[PDB]
Amino acid sequence: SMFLPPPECPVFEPSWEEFADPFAFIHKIRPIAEQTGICKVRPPPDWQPPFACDVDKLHFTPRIQRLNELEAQTRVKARDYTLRTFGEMADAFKSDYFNMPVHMVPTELVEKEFWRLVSTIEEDVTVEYGADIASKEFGSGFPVRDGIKLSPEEEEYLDSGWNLNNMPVMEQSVLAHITADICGMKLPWLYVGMCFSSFCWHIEDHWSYSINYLHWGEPKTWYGVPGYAAEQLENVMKKLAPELFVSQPDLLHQLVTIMNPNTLMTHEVPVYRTNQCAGEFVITFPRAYHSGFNQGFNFAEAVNFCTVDWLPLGRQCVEHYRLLHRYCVFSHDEMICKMASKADVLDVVVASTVQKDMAIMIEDEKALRETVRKLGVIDSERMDFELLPDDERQCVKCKTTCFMSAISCSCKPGLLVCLHHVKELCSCPPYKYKLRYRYTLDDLYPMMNALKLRAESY
Ligand SMILES: O=c1[nH]cnc2c(-n3cc(CCN4CCC(c5cccc(Cl)c5)CC4)cn3)nccc12
Numbered sequence: 001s002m003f004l005p006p007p008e009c010p011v012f013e014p015s016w017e018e019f020a021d022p023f024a025f026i027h028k029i030r031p032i033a034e035q036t037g038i039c040k041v042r043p044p045p046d047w048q049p050p051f052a053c054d055v056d057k058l059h060f061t062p063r064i065q066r067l068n069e070l071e072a073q074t075r076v077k078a079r080d081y082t083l084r085t086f087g088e089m090a091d092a093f094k095s096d097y098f099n100m101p102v103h104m105v106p107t108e109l110v111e112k113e114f115w116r117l118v119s120t121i122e123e124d125v126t127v128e129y130g131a132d133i134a135s136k137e138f139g140s141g142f143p144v145r146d147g148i149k150l151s152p153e154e155e156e157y158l159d160s161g162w163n164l165n166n167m168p169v170m171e172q173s174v175l176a177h178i179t180a181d182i183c184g185m186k187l188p189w190l191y192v193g194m195c196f197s198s199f200c201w202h203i204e205d206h207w208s209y210s211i212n213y214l215h216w217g218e219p220k221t222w223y224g225v226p227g228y229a230a231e232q233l234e235n236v237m238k239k240l241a242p243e244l245f246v247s248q249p250d251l252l253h254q255l256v257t258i259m260n261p262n263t264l265m266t267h268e269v270p271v272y273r274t275n276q277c278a279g280e281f282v283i284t285f286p287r288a289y290h291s292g293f294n295q296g297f298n299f300a301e302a303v304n305f306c307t308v309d310w311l312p313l314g315r316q317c318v319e320h321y322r323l324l325h326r327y328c329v330f331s332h333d334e335m336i337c338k339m340a341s342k343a344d345v346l347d348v349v350v351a352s353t354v355q356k357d358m359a360i361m362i363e364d365e366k367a368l369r370e371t372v373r374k375l376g377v378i379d380s381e382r383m384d385f386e387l388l389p390d391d392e393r394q395c396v397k398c399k400t401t402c403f404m405s406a407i408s409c410s411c412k413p414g415l416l417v418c419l420h421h422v423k424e425l426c427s428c429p430p431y432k433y434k435l436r437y438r439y440t441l442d443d444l445y446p447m448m449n450a451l452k453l454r455a456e457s458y
Pocket residue numbers: 008009010011032035036228
């Protein structure tokens with residue numbers, strides 16, 4: 001067995017003034033951190049949120065994990081455990097595996113042992129992970145307002161930007177304005193780990209950022225790849241594991257896997273590592289691949305978020321989903337138009353950035369409408385796309401969530417195609433088709449002008 005650890009990722013130690021605004025600090029570290037994919041943030045010494053819970057009243061059913069490299073795994077995904085009974089099982093496993101007290105096992109050893117065990121055929125080691133536990137039922141690790149009584153120690157951490165319940169609903173997040181209950185992007189998720197439990201190589205939905213906090217326990221080991229090397233990583237994984245790249249029926253059937261970072265390093269892909277300890281944050285940047293495993297019994301909380309910097313990458317992602325025939329979590333254009341309709345109450349920096357993305361959207365929509373008119377589609381009718389459930393407004397060909405416009409025919413009731421796939425609906429001549437649209441070009445230009453007036457306000 002031979003493992004050459006990847007170089008360390010950047011570690012930041014902000015002052016109270018720097019820490020005060022999470023969004024201003026993330027923008028400042030961005031030129032360094034986006035070159036490594038992941039980064040670590042150590043909060044000021046005196047920032048210590050209170051973690052308190054009853055281990056007997058907290059229940060969950062965990063996922064069973066087979067530890068095999070390049071073996072296909074489902075992204076979404078056995079008995080019931082309390083936080084106490086899971087902890088007893090987790091501690092007994094680690095101490096019996098090494099024949100040592102749980103806290104005396106070196107981190108370098110657990111790391112090299114993890115990579116040996118995933119590559120050995122004759123080893124059939126299985127573990128359990130309390131993964132993707134919803135904060136709605138289980139409750140957040142951070143303080144939340146309840147009508148229970150909270151203590152002054154919990155009061156100071158209720159309104160903090162670093163309390164992961166607040167981060168998505170702040171005015172600097174663009175996901176905050178989305179009316180639809182997406183669930184898996186504005187709400188925090190909880191992770192109860194044990195030795196060797198792991199997360200496979202992946203990127204976030206819509207190429208969003210992520211922020212992870214380790215509340216307590218043994219460290220979490222991470223591997224990260226910068227956003228610029230994403231397609232380079234994917235090509236390496238297509239040659240060595242082609243079975244993972246096949247077309248899937250929906251979002252629930254996403255195929256992911258465990259792969260040694262030294263294999264990526266050999267193929268000239270940049271990889272960085274970190275050991276995240278209790279009380280530390282890890283931030284993942286847009287389109288940054290990441291994977292990892294737990295050193296022992298621990299408790300973590302995580303959430304996705306989108307800044308103004310992300311907006312052009314978000315549009316590029318939806319275009320990439322269309323080429324791959326992959327489902328969207330939400331409509332990017334619907335989010336843009338929702339913010340434009342609330343221009344008078346938006347943050348000035350936000351209004352300025354939304355205005356620039358909207359200008360691109362309008363020019364692309366104008367070109368697409370001219371092309372479908374030249375194909376012989378003459379009839380048209382306005383349609384309120386936001387009222388339809390998502391599974392009722394997807395392109396038959398590319399599976400994109402339609403908002404701005406779509407094509408329908410009376411011969412196929414309920415079916416739709418996006419303006420890129422007009423020839424994929426039916427065998428009828430295009431004069432039988434109808435163009436369904438949310439807004440005319442005349443409705444769109446004053447919406448963008450409202451954003452300009454708000455952005456020019458000083
Ligand atoms: O398309 C590209 N876009 C951007 N960069 C490209 C690139 N290079 C990137 C670098 C930076 C390497 N450097 C290594 C150390 C690291 C660091 C670690 C830990 C702490 C700190 Cl403070 C910093 C910070 C990134 C050098 N070249 N090579 C090829 C292609 C691209």
